[PDB]
Structure to design on (1154 residues):
């Protein structure tokens, strides 16, 4: 699956400096090799953020205490309960018909109030997390044979590595997220985590609060009061909303949390590598035979807004795969945008291709091998 | 009006590789040429996203049904209506005065409640759309004579093109939006100029109107357009606050319009900076000379570009081609150049040129194209009215 | 604290073009020098935006003016007040007990409503500002001796400079913010009352503040009832409570949050860098290649500490032979084989004139920073949007 460095990808200076440009997409590998030196495998190993900050916590199922009521007769003042003016409570004030039937001197409306301590049922929280674009780590690894590690972030872009035989190598890597972080929120339950849209998450009609806060806001979204009955007032629990939520999350890309690491499954790093006094071994792929392809794995949803596929090649390896795509009715405009920097068929493997396509009806072409693909439009959620 | 590749913009290696760096702003072109080969024109043709996701839908003018009221005598329990527990309904509960005048045994307060179904009048929605930074396409084009296409995104940055005489050239383009997408929202009204605007996230979110998501049947905060009157024994009135379109259109005055072409939501600002890798060939350089600082005239004076930048065109009477000396200063600080050009390399060619786009600090500035000057006032940043 | 250009950082072409790559963090300098030419100092001088747009204004202390009350007897219809249908007013409707004790014919509940005008106390606003990623300026400066200026933005990346001796050099600088702008809001209190008065807060924290709010230009406030509570009615009176000044509660919450550095109309960012590709013609670049510093001649001049903007900073002292590159690494307690240190400082070195400064980001939790054999423990607090 590793690719070999191409001549066009590096420049050799007059004073002995060699500048190599690499594009490493998550799970992509490139093998670089200098004359008289062991081939090195370089690849972006992971992209993640350690425990990203918690934003809102939504209550999916309220937990109400027994109801507390307070009534007054048509002459005694207004009714009151300690619970009014306390956190974590939902209250309703009203008037009820009073008379001799219920211990009152006069006939008439009496002041009545009902409160309830509203908390969330254990394990019934939906917590949202936000990424800090500058805290997302992109880990690159270098290892002998066609072992060192270096991590970058938007803020940390330059490093120096000692690759033995290669000496001191300067690594300048421009990091790039495959997800629009600003518009993203990781929804988590106590599939338990999903990658949802900021706007969708913010408008969820549920009680909410920040971590640390003890009481909930808009608790009345799950707690309603009924009409008063002289000296009683019913309270309604709108029930558990987990079902409705899971139904809405159907099909939404899941978040991949490993321990405390919140992984992104899409993205890349493009680095400029600086080497001294040595000769890089180039290589220039030839175009693969346009007719010796077969679908090893037909185009399918990658699980993160992209299309992946695998082809099998019977021709002479290694070679560059000819990939292109068209939008139904426009056979002259290539609309395929590859995530895979250099799709190739090697001797050990290759044939994997990841790309982005315009929404609608498309036809993917790997040489003469074709296959149609429907790209759903963008949405923030149900 | 294309520009010619300069020597400083490319390096030729010892093993025969040539690395070319290009900056292509939307609408900008660069002509590259190699010995014994046809000159190629390279440019950023368009930047856009196909059907961006819909966020909120705002109701500009409510459409109510028929009011429904229910009352009870000072002894009959509380009044109730079915609508009280249904979607798409706005209700109000209160206490009214009842006596013999209205068919009640006793004199006193009696329960009463009114409800109405609230929907939005057809073609009276304001819909917001959000861009997906990673789904914005930057289409670069290559064509002979001083034709191929390649599109890039934040995620898709590398490609290989076969440009005939030039062979296989690698294209590595770093995409860059000219608009802060995270803080942007495209506001749109229903079909049946202008009908779409580029508004600020924070402004959009705080609009005081009823709203809902596409697909949802009912509206939230429907009472922002529906208000109930005081109760009258056995009647209670329901008010509709009217069409807010006028108010909104007023607030959108001067706001940059969105350019929607079919399903394509275009950005009118941005650029791509690419590194082009070519093998075994000889790049023809070229190095412009400063234009005569005194042979300039305003073909089109500095003006708002329509997308938070200043544009202008100058005429040159000297010997072409040459590089235009552009700079600007903030009134009172004639030593600091505050002009930041969007136009990578402003030049006067033989076929044309003379166009310049740039950003300037807010306040009073003076633009200088050689000795030709012109004042310009830059308004500060705002999220809208 | 300038560093010298290294050989690996530049390529000299066959036709005489030299391509130089520089990484300039805010406050970082790099000295470049060519054969028979004066050394030039190049650095990122400042990062800022001139007067960012205002978003929400929050009221910290309401100015309630008068309490209008209106009542009715058990038979006269509902009570009403003009203020009930005006902006800038908080109203409450209820029912009171009426009889002969209070001028009413019958005994029973009577309509009653109370309203109060609501504005904000002078100088008691909390205003939010939003940055415009494309309007943040990154100013680079070039000056002789180991003076010109060039500013860049996400949109303005290319420039041509005339550095005399060096001639016309092309500058291509890719700008990069050290702050997640989309998730940032500058919270500001009415200056001239404490001249910190500005903070760099999280948008999700800012948006959820439970206070009355409005946009600049708007005359009235939204959710004014967040600072006004009504009491129970008493026949023909109803009290109105001002929930009081919230300034204290807020300042308490901002404790520890990074301050925003405003200088005049310039809202400065204190983190971020620029990486440029410099293009030079016909000249020969003087390289230089640092040697690793003596792994044992280091001492803490300033131990690892919070930088004030989400990073760790430190300074060491070197007694060995200068100049040299500092060996910096860090490990997450229990994994002595993985370097988790991410340097903000592009090339940490000990020069003759100075050096020794190091800025870096570390994973949350317990870490051990290693500058050679010199070590030091560091606890990194996790991410949060605020209290």
């Amino acid at each position: 699956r590793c690719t070999h460095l191409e001549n066009r990808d590096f420049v050799t200076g007059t004073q002995g400096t060699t500048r190599v440009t690499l594009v490493l997409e998550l799970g992509g590998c490139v093998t670089i090799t200098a004359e008289g030196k062991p081939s090195m495998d370089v690849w972006l190993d992971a992209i993640y953020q350690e425990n990203p900050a918690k934003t809102r916590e939504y209550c999916l199922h309220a937990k109400l205490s027994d109801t507390k009521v307070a009534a007054r007769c048509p002459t005694m003042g207004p009714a009151t309960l300690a619970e009014e003016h306390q956190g974590g409570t939902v209250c309703k004030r009203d008037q009820s018909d009073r008379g001799w039937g219920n211990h009152c001197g006069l006939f008439g409306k009496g002041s009545i109030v009902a409160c309830v301590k509203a908390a969330c049922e254990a394990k019934k929280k939906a917590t949202g997390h936000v990424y800090d674009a500058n805290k997302i780590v992109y880990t690159v690894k270098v290892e002998p044979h066609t072992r060192k590690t270096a991590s970058f972030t938007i803020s940390s872009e330059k490093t120096i590595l000692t690759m033995g035989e290669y000496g001191d190598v300067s690594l300048l890597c421009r990091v790039a997220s495959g997800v629009d972080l600003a518009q993203t929120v990781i929804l988590e339950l106590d599939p338990t985590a999903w990658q949802v849209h900021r706007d969708w998450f913010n408008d969820l009609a549920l009680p909410w609060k920040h971590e640390g806060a003890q009481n909930w806001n808009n608790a009345e979204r799950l707690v309603e009061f009924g009409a008063p009955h002289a000296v009683k007032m019913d309270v309604y629990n709108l029930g558990d909303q987990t079902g409705v939520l899971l139904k809405a999350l159907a099909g939404v890309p899941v978040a991949h949390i490993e321990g405390t690491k919140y992984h992104l499954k899409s993205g890349h790093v493009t680095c400029e590598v600086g080497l001294e006094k040595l000769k890089m071994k180039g290589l220039t792929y030839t175009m693969c035979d346009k007719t010796k392809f077969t679908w090893k794995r037909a185009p399918t949803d990658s699980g993160h807004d992209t299309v992946v596929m695998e082809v099998t090649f019977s021709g002479t390896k290694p070679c560059r795969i000819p990939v292109r795509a068209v939008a139904h009715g426009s056979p002259d405009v290539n609309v395929a945008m590859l995530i895979t920097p250099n799709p190739t068929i090697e001797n050990n493997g290759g044939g994997f291709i990841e790309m982005q396509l315009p929404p609608g009806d498309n036809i993917i072409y790997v040489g003469e091998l074709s296959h149609q693909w429907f790209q759903k439009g963008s949405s923030i959620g149900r």
